[PDB]
Design an enzyme around this catalytic site. Structure first.
Site, PDB file in Angstrom:
ATOM      1  N   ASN A 107     -44.764  26.421  12.101  1.00  0.00           N
ATOM      2  CA  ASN A 107     -43.651  25.493  11.959  1.00  0.00           C
ATOM      3  C   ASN A 107     -43.539  24.598  13.192  1.00  0.00           C
ATOM      4  OD1 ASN A 107     -43.383  27.036   9.734  1.00  0.00           O
ATOM      5  ND2 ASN A 107     -41.523  28.108  10.392  1.00  0.00           N
TER       6      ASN A 107
ATOM      7  N   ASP B 195     -37.366  32.573   8.871  1.00  0.00           N
ATOM      8  CA  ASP B 195     -38.743  33.037   9.066  1.00  0.00           C
ATOM      9  C   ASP B 195     -39.516  32.196  10.092  1.00  0.00           C
ATOM     10  OD1 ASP B 195     -39.136  31.549   5.958  1.00  0.00           O
ATOM     11  OD2 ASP B 195     -40.319  30.801   7.662  1.00  0.00           O
TER      12      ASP B 195
ATOM     13  N   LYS C 137     -41.907  30.594  12.274  1.00  0.00           N
ATOM     14  CA  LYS C 137     -43.190  31.136  12.678  1.00  0.00           C
ATOM     15  C   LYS C 137     -43.989  30.059  13.399  1.00  0.00           C
ATOM     16  CE  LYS C 137     -43.824  31.481   8.358  1.00  0.00           C
ATOM     17  NZ  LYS C 137     -44.325  31.822   7.010  1.00  0.00           N
TER      18      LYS C 137
ATOM     19  N   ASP D 296     -40.773  21.851   8.634  1.00  0.00           N
ATOM     20  CA  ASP D 296     -40.611  22.751   7.498  1.00  0.00           C
ATOM     21  C   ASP D 296     -39.293  23.520   7.605  1.00  0.00           C
ATOM     22  OD1 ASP D 296     -43.327  22.341   6.155  1.00  0.00           O
ATOM     23  OD2 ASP D 296     -44.142  23.428   7.880  1.00  0.00           O
TER      24      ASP D 296
ATOM     25  N   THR E 140     -42.509  35.460   6.260  1.00  0.00           N
ATOM     26  CA  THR E 140     -43.381  36.233   7.135  1.00  0.00           C
ATOM     27  C   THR E 140     -42.529  37.214   7.926  1.00  0.00           C
ATOM     28  OG1 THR E 140     -44.790  34.315   7.423  1.00  0.00           O
ATOM     29  CG2 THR E 140     -45.222  36.165   8.893  1.00  0.00           C
TER      30      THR E 140
HETATM   31  N1  LIG Z   1     -45.743  16.085   9.994  1.00  0.00           N
HETATM   32  C1  LIG Z   1     -46.566  17.035   9.545  1.00  0.00           C
HETATM   33  N2  LIG Z   1     -46.045  17.960   8.690  1.00  0.00           N
HETATM   34  C2  LIG Z   1     -46.848  18.934   8.241  1.00  0.00           C
HETATM   35  N3  LIG Z   1     -48.132  19.158   8.530  1.00  0.00           N
HETATM   36  C3  LIG Z   1     -48.637  18.232   9.372  1.00  0.00           C
HETATM   37  C4  LIG Z   1     -47.937  17.160   9.917  1.00  0.00           C
HETATM   38  N4  LIG Z   1     -48.769  16.427  10.771  1.00  0.00           N
HETATM   39  C5  LIG Z   1     -49.937  17.044  10.720  1.00  0.00           C
HETATM   40  N5  LIG Z   1     -49.920  18.181   9.884  1.00  0.00           N
HETATM   41  C6  LIG Z   1     -51.110  19.079   9.530  1.00  0.00           C
HETATM   42  O1  LIG Z   1     -51.085  19.420   8.145  1.00  0.00           O
HETATM   43  C7  LIG Z   1     -50.994  20.864   7.951  1.00  0.00           C
HETATM   44  C8  LIG Z   1     -50.213  21.170   6.681  1.00  0.00           C
HETATM   45  O2  LIG Z   1     -49.251  22.299   6.825  1.00  0.00           O
HETATM   46  P1  LIG Z   1     -48.179  22.799   5.678  1.00  0.00           P
HETATM   47  O3  LIG Z   1     -48.897  23.046   4.375  1.00  0.00           O
HETATM   48  O4  LIG Z   1     -46.978  21.895   5.642  1.00  0.00           O
HETATM   49  O5  LIG Z   1     -47.666  24.228   6.272  1.00  0.00           O
HETATM   50  P2  LIG Z   1     -46.844  25.605   5.949  1.00  0.00           P
HETATM   51  O6  LIG Z   1     -46.678  25.781   4.457  1.00  0.00           O
HETATM   52  O7  LIG Z   1     -45.597  25.460   6.789  1.00  0.00           O
HETATM   53  N6  LIG Z   1     -47.831  26.798   6.563  1.00  0.00           N
HETATM   54  P3  LIG Z   1     -48.031  28.401   6.195  1.00  0.00           P
HETATM   55  O8  LIG Z   1     -47.607  29.259   7.366  1.00  0.00           O
HETATM   56  O9  LIG Z   1     -49.477  28.730   5.891  1.00  0.00           O
HETATM   57  O10 LIG Z   1     -47.203  28.757   4.983  1.00  0.00           O
HETATM   58  C9  LIG Z   1     -50.435  21.312   9.308  1.00  0.00           C
HETATM   59  O11 LIG Z   1     -50.645  22.683   9.606  1.00  0.00           O
HETATM   60  C10 LIG Z   1     -51.280  20.424  10.227  1.00  0.00           C
HETATM   61  O12 LIG Z   1     -52.646  20.787  10.161  1.00  0.00           O
END
Ligand SMILES: Nc1ncnc2c1ncn2[C@@H]1O[C@H](COP(=O)(O)OP(=O)(O)NP(=O)(O)O)[C@@H](O)[C@H]1O
Length: 261
Positions: A122, A117, A119, A135, A146
């Protein structure tokens, strides 16, 4: 060595689908005062190994077991999401990002990691404005994802290989060059059918080279799809769309990103 006490919370950064994310300072040596991103887990979203060294993949620095939980410490990436940054525009600016993406993606594939997925959320930028894939270990379930970015074999709960992710890579590319997604309906279900059936129409404002690459990436049958073989992104890197890319300078982060944070 490390434990939660080695790290002081500054703020919670977000609470997405794939976990809760804190900004932290290391207070312990040797990396005293170094900021990270922490992610608390374990105790829908399952996991798989990660020890990845690549200029365009997030580094896990620490990962430890404390009170029936799993903490993950990682690069703190200050740049935000790639898509956010563009929404504030050239084909030459996208090709940089797509070149860096391809290298990191291809690295995850050689280790057996597959997004399905993949997106825009990531793909984060760092201080310098180079991309970092995140991720990649995870795996929602009750496989959810997605739909806009999913290859046909994946939408159809058939088998899949790394080819799935070059489909997605084409979707990202398309989304970047056009601002639209190539297949989208009113519903998750209408979107799914367009992914299986709709023959994509090339926007006629894209270069002949970008359209060449998008037709190559958008093959319903994975085995016809660019990158689908075992050498993966070797095929993709050789495409005329990347004639201007010195892949060795790129890996070494010696090519100026087009947008500075
Ligand atoms: N190393 C990092 N890993 C993850 N997030 C980070 C990092 N550094 C900064 N960030 C910030 O923290 C947020 C947390 O994202 P996260 O909850 O891990 O995303 P996700 O579940 O992959 N997104 P989604 O598409 O909504 O499901 C990021 O989008 C950035 O704003």
């Amino acid at each position: 060595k490390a434990d939660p006490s080695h790290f002081e919370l500054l703020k919670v950064l977000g609470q997405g689908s794939f976990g809760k994310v804190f900004l932290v300072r290391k207070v312990t040596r040797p990396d005293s005062g170094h900021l990270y991103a922490m992610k608390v887990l374990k105790k829908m979203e399952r996991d798989i190994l990660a020890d990845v060294n690549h200029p365009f993949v997030v580094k896990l620095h620490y990962a430890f077991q404390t009170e029936g939980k799993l903490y993950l410490i990682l690069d703190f990436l200050r740049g935000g999401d790639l898509f956010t940054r563009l929404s504030k525009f050239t084909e030459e600016d996208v090709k940089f990002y797509l070149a860096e993406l391809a290298l990191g993606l291809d690295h995850l594939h050689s280790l057996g990691i597959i997004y399905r997925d993949l997106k825009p959320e990531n793909i984060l930028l760092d201080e310098e404005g180079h991309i970092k894939l995140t991720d990649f270990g995870l795996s929602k379930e009750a496989f959810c994802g997605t739909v806009e970015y999913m290859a046909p074999e994946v939408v159809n709960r058939q088998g899949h290989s790394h080819s799935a992710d070059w489909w997605s890579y084409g979707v990202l590319m398309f989304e970047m060059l056009t601002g639209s997604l190539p297949f989208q309906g009113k519903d998750r279900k209408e979107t799914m059918t367009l992914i299986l059936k709709a023959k994509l129409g090339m926007p006629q404002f894209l270069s002949t080279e970008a359209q060449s690459l998008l037709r190559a990436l958008f093959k319903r049958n994975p085995a016809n799809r660019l990158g689908s073989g075992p050498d993966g992104a070797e095929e993709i890197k050789r495409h005329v769309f990347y004639s201007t890319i010195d892949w060795n300078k790129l890996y070494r982060r010696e090519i100026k990103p087009p947008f500075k944070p």
